[PDB]
Amino acid sequence: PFSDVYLRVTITDRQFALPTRLRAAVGSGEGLFITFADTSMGGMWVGYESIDPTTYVVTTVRNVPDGEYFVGLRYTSVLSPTPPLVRDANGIVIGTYQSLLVRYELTLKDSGEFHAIITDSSRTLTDGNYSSLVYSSTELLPNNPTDASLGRTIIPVRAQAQDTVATFEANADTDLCILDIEYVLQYRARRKRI
């Protein structure tokens, strides 16, 4: 699974006992995470509904069958590229204050939904979840992991190129592998160079 300090445990009648070495962490804001351990659905997220304060018994969501499961904690995987640049034949940098960024193109080898935030010097521009798995892909089936072997995503920016900050987060059971990044740049010189 995608979790820290995970242990294996058995679930019966949608109930089990919380292992000792996680009681302290969960009591201080750490997020409890559960996943399937076997069969075709291995690796998929499952949730919980309550924790008894006196006995530390946990009750899972409906319709989970008896078997083996993992239990652990969550973490984040932030990343942030560097803004593009314009470079002439000799390698000199030009147009630091006269260029505008329009879009990002992302190619992913395998991934699910993630979260993207784009901000400017004084205001937010873009926000919300994105994904590379569509409703017409054979990869999307019940009782199977929700991942796509290959796809693409597009994000609009519409702001000055270098006055931007971009981040991509993911803290779930799915991976996030970035193969390439592409952009669309709007720059227009109005005099020859020499």
Binding site: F2, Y75, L79, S80, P81, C177, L179
Partner: peptide
């Protein structure tokens, strides 16, 4: 940004700089 070498990024956390497989997430502990 004027001086950064090719391939450098601005922020990385709980990621891997793995070759052959790309820039993916790290496994669990």
């Amino acid at each position: 940004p004027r001086e950064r070498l090719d391939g450098q990024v601005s922020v990385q956390l709980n990621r891997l700089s793995d070759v052959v497989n790309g820039n993916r997430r790290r496994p669990g502990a």
